[PDB]
Ligand binder design. Sequence first.
Ligand SMILES: CC(C)n1nnnc1SCc1c(C(=O)O)sc2cccc(F)c12
Length: 167
Amino acid sequence: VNSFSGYLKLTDNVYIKNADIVEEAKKVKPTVVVNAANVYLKHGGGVAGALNKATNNAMQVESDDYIATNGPLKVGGSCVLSGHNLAKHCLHVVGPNVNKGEDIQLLKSAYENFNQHEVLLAPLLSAGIFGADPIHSLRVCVDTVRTNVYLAVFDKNLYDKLVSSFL
Ligand SMILES: CC(C)n1nnnc1SCc1c(C(=O)O)sc2cccc(F)c12
């Protein structure tokens, strides 16, 4: 039993809710919140901008030190950093950005990072301003992630579309 409330069950291990991931994280304080990051950990917009704003820019400060030490992530890769006021940890995961011309085939590799954590609160990778087909991303999620994932979908019309089209 965990404290995630109001989620629709898609599969044995994947759940979904129309919710602001910042507000869900503040309420639940999950062990892991997933950020939809880029390789430079520049948290400008979308999920990343929203999470970073909620941390008062502390996520960005920490991220800049990470990059200065380690260099950029790979598309499809991840790193674990602090969750600040939102979660114990933030798993920064880089899905492909179609609006940068990046290979959507890397989406499965991106979701594989979730399997290193027993329970996660996450957005749909590569959706929104990353430009991928969200129905496809949800399919890749359910077919790749084996650990317990709680998906928070910000856009109400998107949530409705995803539920109504899910196989
Ligand atoms: C958190 C919330 C307040 N917020 N604010 N600004 N953007 C958002 S989330 C829009 C969105 C998704 C969704 O609608 O769930 S998944 C997804 C994946 C990558 C980038 C995204 F932008 C995005």
